[PDB]
Design an enzyme around this catalytic site. Structure first.
Site, PDB file in Angstrom:
ATOM      1  N   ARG A  35       9.740   3.444  14.140  1.00 58.53           N
ATOM      2  CA  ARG A  35       8.479   4.159  13.861  1.00 58.53           C
ATOM      3  C   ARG A  35       7.509   3.911  14.974  1.00 58.53           C
ATOM      4  O   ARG A  35       7.153   2.763  15.264  1.00 58.53           O
ATOM      5  CB  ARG A  35       7.874   3.691  12.537  1.00 58.53           C
ATOM      6  CG  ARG A  35       6.484   4.292  12.282  1.00 58.53           C
ATOM      7  CD  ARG A  35       6.124   4.340  10.789  1.00 58.53           C
ATOM      8  NE  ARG A  35       4.795   4.955  10.674  1.00 58.53           N
ATOM      9  CZ  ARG A  35       3.625   4.338  10.666  1.00 58.53           C
ATOM     10  NH1 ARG A  35       3.515   3.017  10.532  1.00 58.53           N
ATOM     11  NH2 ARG A  35       2.524   5.067  10.749  1.00 58.53           N
ATOM     12  N   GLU A  59      -3.059   6.212   8.287  1.00 58.34           N
ATOM     13  CA  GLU A  59      -4.222   5.513   7.730  1.00 58.34           C
ATOM     14  C   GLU A  59      -5.593   6.148   8.000  1.00 58.34           C
ATOM     15  O   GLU A  59      -6.491   5.576   8.687  1.00 58.34           O
ATOM     16  CB  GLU A  59      -4.288   4.053   8.163  1.00 58.34           C
ATOM     17  CG  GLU A  59      -3.081   3.276   7.741  1.00 58.34           C
ATOM     18  CD  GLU A  59      -3.315   1.786   7.608  1.00 58.34           C
ATOM     19  OE1 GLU A  59      -2.319   0.998   7.736  1.00 58.34           O
ATOM     20  OE2 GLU A  59      -4.491   1.369   7.338  1.00 58.34           O
ATOM     21  N   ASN A  67       1.755   1.880   3.838  1.00 57.42           N
ATOM     22  CA  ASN A  67       1.515   0.637   4.574  1.00 57.42           C
ATOM     23  C   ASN A  67       0.943  -0.332   3.569  1.00 57.42           C
ATOM     24  O   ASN A  67      -0.046  -0.006   2.824  1.00 57.42           O
ATOM     25  CB  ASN A  67       0.506   0.880   5.705  1.00 57.42           C
ATOM     26  CG  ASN A  67       1.055   1.746   6.818  1.00 57.42           C
ATOM     27  OD1 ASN A  67       2.217   2.173   6.791  1.00 57.42           O
ATOM     28  ND2 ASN A  67       0.218   2.035   7.763  1.00 57.42           N
ATOM     29  N   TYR A 104      -0.173  -4.457   3.088  1.00 58.77           N
ATOM     30  CA  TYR A 104      -0.484  -5.778   3.550  1.00 58.77           C
ATOM     31  C   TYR A 104      -1.047  -6.719   2.506  1.00 58.77           C
ATOM     32  O   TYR A 104      -0.737  -7.922   2.523  1.00 58.77           O
ATOM     33  CB  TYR A 104      -1.521  -5.696   4.724  1.00 58.77           C
ATOM     34  CG  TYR A 104      -0.990  -5.009   5.972  1.00 58.77           C
ATOM     35  CD1 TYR A 104      -1.087  -3.646   6.167  1.00 58.77           C
ATOM     36  CD2 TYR A 104      -0.250  -5.747   6.930  1.00 58.77           C
ATOM     37  CE1 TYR A 104      -0.499  -3.038   7.246  1.00 58.77           C
ATOM     38  CE2 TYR A 104       0.311  -5.134   8.032  1.00 58.77           C
ATOM     39  CZ  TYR A 104       0.169  -3.797   8.235  1.00 58.77           C
ATOM     40  OH  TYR A 104       0.734  -3.130   9.319  1.00 58.77           O
TER      41      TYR A 104
HETATM   42  O1  LIG Z   1      -3.760  -4.938  11.320  1.00 57.24           O
HETATM   43  C1  LIG Z   1      -2.325  -4.736  11.276  1.00 57.24           C
HETATM   44  C2  LIG Z   1      -1.996  -3.238  11.366  1.00 57.24           C
HETATM   45  O2  LIG Z   1      -2.692  -2.616  10.306  1.00 57.24           O
HETATM   46  C3  LIG Z   1      -2.338  -1.280  10.067  1.00 57.24           C
HETATM   47  O3  LIG Z   1      -3.250  -0.880   9.092  1.00 57.24           O
HETATM   48  C4  LIG Z   1      -2.356  -0.319  11.261  1.00 57.24           C
HETATM   49  O4  LIG Z   1      -1.631   0.910  11.063  1.00 57.24           O
HETATM   50  C5  LIG Z   1      -1.801  -1.083  12.505  1.00 57.24           C
HETATM   51  O5  LIG Z   1      -2.029  -0.265  13.605  1.00 57.24           O
HETATM   52  C6  LIG Z   1      -2.409  -2.484  12.655  1.00 57.24           C
HETATM   53  O6  LIG Z   1      -1.832  -3.055  13.812  1.00 57.24           O
END
Ligand SMILES: OC[C@H]1O[C@@H](O)[C@H](O)[C@@H](O)[C@@H]1O
Ligand code: NA
Length: 441
Positions: free
Chosen positions: A74, A163, A290, A292
């Site tokens: 990707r 995003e 995405n 996190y």
């Molecule tokens: O902060 C970690 C990552 O966060 C994501 O939301 C983004 O798409 C990335 O470009 C960034 O490097």
């Protein structure tokens, strides 16, 4: 125990974060060139001028992906390389570059999952309001047309935006990302024109494509949980969930913008007629998530919009910059599967930042990032068990890179990048993913 035999296993990057060669071969100026060269906007004085030098060194990147046993990559195409004035003529040399890279990928058995917009808006468009202008949406779709016309015989899986929440809110409301504006109404306007540009691009791409395409969009979703069951904390949780998640999910699902958030924003809300909402809901083939972190929300009447702040949990591990909450990945996928129309799904990013160093033996011992992958992959198995139509997983990032306002100082890679020599080295977590994938493939 096992993933589907045809599961997509990849790592992810973005062009501005890795490519460097910012002035080579006709590339125009992006908002992130301007922003990173503005004193004080990046924490450590760095820019994407060199980055990982992947414009020249994507072969080395292909070498890493191969060493990792991945089957997909990707990455993003830099609009500034393709239409350097933003709206104007194409730059064939830009397209040829990505054509060679796509051929290199396919020759290695790596399926290209291309992102058309990962934040590097051409600065000439920003000079005419950027995502503050509806014209930017129009010329985005033109750009999407040009790219798919040339590379759509080889690339089937495309994402329009990465995003839009960040592009709109960090870029135009909080000022922490390019272009660096600080106005709520501008942020919300930008969110609308991003969404519109998305919708217009999908339609353009389907008409330009030389074969049928699998077109998606990529959203970061932050599962949100009230810190207590008080009406105050519950309300805060809703507002945050609307501000980050539902603001994008709802109009994409044909449900309009969420009325509660419209009421909360008031006059700051954008002007959204029904023809634009129809365009924004252009049918997609997949959704990228995405993931996190979570947000455990307490009401914060005195903070700015959305008046909801994170309640830290010292019992949970923290990385260099985030709290780790793998269960949130199951939670948000279960919600998508049962509550929204998008399917199939791909995890288009998941990973973490640590204070990585090369140890005396030459390895990078990033056990906390290994534990991070292991835990999140376990949650994906659970999600699959519940019938979530998940078809792939991409670790963020293939390699340490230019981490936006944090600069080169914040390392997210599964491969270590020496930014002086440009040598890459696979971290222990990368070797773990290799061996895990090899067990699954
Ligand atoms: O902060 C970690 C990552 O966060 C994501 O939301 C983004 O798409 C990335 O470009 C960034 O490097
Ligand atoms: Na820690």
């Amino acid at each position: 125990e096992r993933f589907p035999a045809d599961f997509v296993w990849g790592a992810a990057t973005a062009a501005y974060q890795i490519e460097g060669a910012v002035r080579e071969d006709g590339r125009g100026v992006s908002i992130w060139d301007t922003f990173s060269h503005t004193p004080g906007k990046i924490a450590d004085g760095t820019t994407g001028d060199v980055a990982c030098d992947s414009y020249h060194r994507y072969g080395e990147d292909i070498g890493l992906l191969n060493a990792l046993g991945m089957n997909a990559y990707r990455f993003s195409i830099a609009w500034p390389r393709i239409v350097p004035l933003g709206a104007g003529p194409i730059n064939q040399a830009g397209l040829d570059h990505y054509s060679r890279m796509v051929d290199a990928l396919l020759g290695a058995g790596l399926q290209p999952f291309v992102t058309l917009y990962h934040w590097d808006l051409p600065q000439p468009l920003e000079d005419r309001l950027g995502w503050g202008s509806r014209a930017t949406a129009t010329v985005f779709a033109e750009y999407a047309d040009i790219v798919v016309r040339q590379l759509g015989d080889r690339v089937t899986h495309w994402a329009t935006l990465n995003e839009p929440w960040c592009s709109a809110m960090l870029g135009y409301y909080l000022g922490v990302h390019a272009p660096g504006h600080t106005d709520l109404k501008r942020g919300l306007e930008a969110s609308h024109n991003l969404l519109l540009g998305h919708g217009l691009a999908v339609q353009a791409m389907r008409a330009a494509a030389p074969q049928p395409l699998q077109i998606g969009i990529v959203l970061q979703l932050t599962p949100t949980y009230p810190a207590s069951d008080s009406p105050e904390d519950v309300a805060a949780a809703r507002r945050f969930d609307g501000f980050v998640n539902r603001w994008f999910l709802d109009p994409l699902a044909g449900r309009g913008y969420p009325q509660d958030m419209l009421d909360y924003y008031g006059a700051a809300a954008p002007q959204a007629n029904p023809e634009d909402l129809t365009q924004i809901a252009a049918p997609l083939d997949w959704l990228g998530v995405n993931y996190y972190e979570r947000m455990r929300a307490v009401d914060a009447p005195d903070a700015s919009l959305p008046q909801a702040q994170r309640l830290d949990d010292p019992d949970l591990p923290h990385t260099a910059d985030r709290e780790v909450y793998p269960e949130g990945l199951y939670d948000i996928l279960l919600r998508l599967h049962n509550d929204y129309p998008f399917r199939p799904l791909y995890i288009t990013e998941n990973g973490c930042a640590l204070h990585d160093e090369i140890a005396e033996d030459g390895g990078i011992h990033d056990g906390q990032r290994q534990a991070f992958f292991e835990a999140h992959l376990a949650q994906l198995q659970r999600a699959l068990a519940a019938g979530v139509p998940l078809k792939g997983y991409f670790a963020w990032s293939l390699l340490d890179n230019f981490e936006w306002a944090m600069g080169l100082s914040m390392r997210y890679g599964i491969c270590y990048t020496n930014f002086e020599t440009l040598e890459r080295r696979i971290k222990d977590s990368g070797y773990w993913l290799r061996d895990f994938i090899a067990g699954q493939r």
